[PDB]
Design an enzyme around this catalytic site. Structure first.
Site, PDB file in Angstrom:
ATOM      1  CB  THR B  29      -0.913   0.084   1.237  1.00  0.00           C
ATOM      2  OG1 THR B  29      -0.105   0.069   2.421  1.00  0.00           O
ATOM      3  CG2 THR B  29      -1.875  -1.075   1.269  1.00  0.00           C
ATOM      4  CB  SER B  30       0.207   4.679  -1.299  1.00  0.00           C
ATOM      5  OG  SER B  30       0.503   4.436  -2.661  1.00  0.00           O
ATOM      6  CG  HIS B  88       5.249  -1.060   3.200  1.00  0.00           C
ATOM      7  ND1 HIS B  88       4.207  -1.092   4.092  1.00  0.00           N
ATOM      8  CD2 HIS B  88       4.781  -0.434   2.096  1.00  0.00           C
ATOM      9  CE1 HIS B  88       3.149  -0.508   3.557  1.00  0.00           C
ATOM     10  NE2 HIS B  88       3.469  -0.101   2.344  1.00  0.00           N
ATOM     11  N   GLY B  89       8.339  -2.620   5.950  1.00  0.00           N
ATOM     12  CA  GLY B  89       9.429  -3.461   6.407  1.00  0.00           C
ATOM     13  C   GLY B  89       8.942  -4.728   7.064  1.00  0.00           C
ATOM     14  CB  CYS B 130       6.104  -3.238   9.791  1.00  0.00           C
ATOM     15  SG  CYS B 130       4.609  -2.244   9.957  1.00  0.00           S
TER      16      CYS B 130
END
Lengths: 4, 229, 230, 4
Positions: B29-30, B88-89, B130
């Site tokens: 997601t953005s 993100h992660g 994350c």
């Protein structure tokens, strides 16, 4: 609020 | 003696990688609100006299190339190095726009034996991403790194689409208030308390509602770090 | 305000788990020098006014039961909690004499929602153990207020001298003795980082293990500054 | 010197  | 020398001609680079928009095929997601974080960080580190470079929407290949290239610059006149990753992660991983990169691969470029103009100088990696899906050389080559993680190992990390991420907004606020006063570990400790006490998620989805976050400082520094001198 | 309240009637417990001898079937070597560490820690924390309990050669079952039982004590009059683990390890794992236990299982007993008499108080886990085989050469989160003082970086071996004790514990005790009455705990641990990184290098007849270095790793989820004095 |  959103999660990464 | 007990404090890093921070009176080189330059404070050093602050590289900010701001990944907002991801390739459709990744299904990621953005990250609404991340531009607020990137702007806050740019201003905050500008006021600390870092040479800030903002990069947006980098592929995994671009992230690795950027880090490699930066690690091959001559940092002799620079006191420190800062890299901020907004993406993100998962545990040990940060996402390029088209896929993941190992945090280890990025940080390895700056090892004491691989970037000699940063040997003995603090190398700070600040990571808003994350870390999973839970809710609530006579010196070592790994010496002098500090990882300021937004969240505990294994946990999601929270980002508000309007306000920016809990961690980055708190970090910038504490740096603004205390960078001329407190040692960096104590600043980050204030960040821990701010995130832990002032934020709680709101969601229509009971699974994601009323959740809390604690950031995680991982220090292999060998001296105290003051942004002033 | 910015510092943990450390003037409760008691400083708190210091549980030291000293695993030296391992069941033969595990194939784990005996950890010569660890008694030196355990004795140094006992004295060091005694002088900080911790109620020290030393336990030796515990099975994985005994470790879990001990930590469960300690987490069920009333810590209301105690400022903090300290647990020191001296054993073999890998990433995320500490060994009982008969097999591994997840560090997460041990620390989970002390979560803010699971040990209410320690909610809001610093919970310190000090860990001398390998983390791999690499060589260098409520309205509060349940995970808040933990500090992990790891002897070594993630993924790396940790070094123990059979005569002198482990590099990390040696250094930790020395820095606590010298600075606990004057420095905040993160700054003490930073001094420990520098001591380990600069004053130690392995000597081995085996080229693979010779001339290697170590950097400890501070993992802090604390929300306040921690001073041992008040 | 030994490893853990």
């Amino acid at each position: 609020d959103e999660v990464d | 003696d007990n404090s890093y020398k921070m009176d080189y001609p330059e404070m050093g680079l602050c590289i900010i990688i701001n990944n907002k928009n991801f390739h459709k095929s990744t299904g990621m997601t953005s990250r609404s609100g991340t531009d607020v974080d990137a702007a806050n960080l740019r201003e905050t580190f500008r006021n600390l006299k870092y040479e800030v470079r903002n990069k947006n929407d980098l592929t995994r290949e671009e992230i690795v190339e950027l880090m490699r290239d930066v690690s091959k610059e001559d940092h002799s006149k620079r006191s420190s190095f800062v890299c901020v990753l907004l993406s993100h992660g998962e545990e040990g991983i940060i996402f390029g726009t088209n896929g993941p990169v190992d945090l280890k691969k990025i940080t390895n470029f700056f090892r004491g034996d691989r970037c000699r103009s940063l040997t003995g100088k603090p190398k700070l990696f600040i990571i808003q991403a994350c870390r999973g899906t839970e809710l609530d050389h006579k010196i070592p080559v790994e010496a002098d790194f500090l990882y300021a993680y937004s969240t505990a190992p294994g946990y999601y990390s929270w980002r508000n689409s309007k306000d920016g991420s809990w961690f980055i907004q708190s970090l910038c606020a504490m740096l603004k208030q205390y960078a001329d006063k407190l040692e960096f570990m104590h600043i980050l400790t204030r960040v821990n308390r701010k995130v832990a006490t002032e934020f709680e998620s709101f969601s229509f989805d009971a699974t994601f509602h009323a959740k809390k976050q604690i950031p995680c400082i991982k220090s292999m520094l060998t001296k105290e770090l003051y942004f002033y001198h």
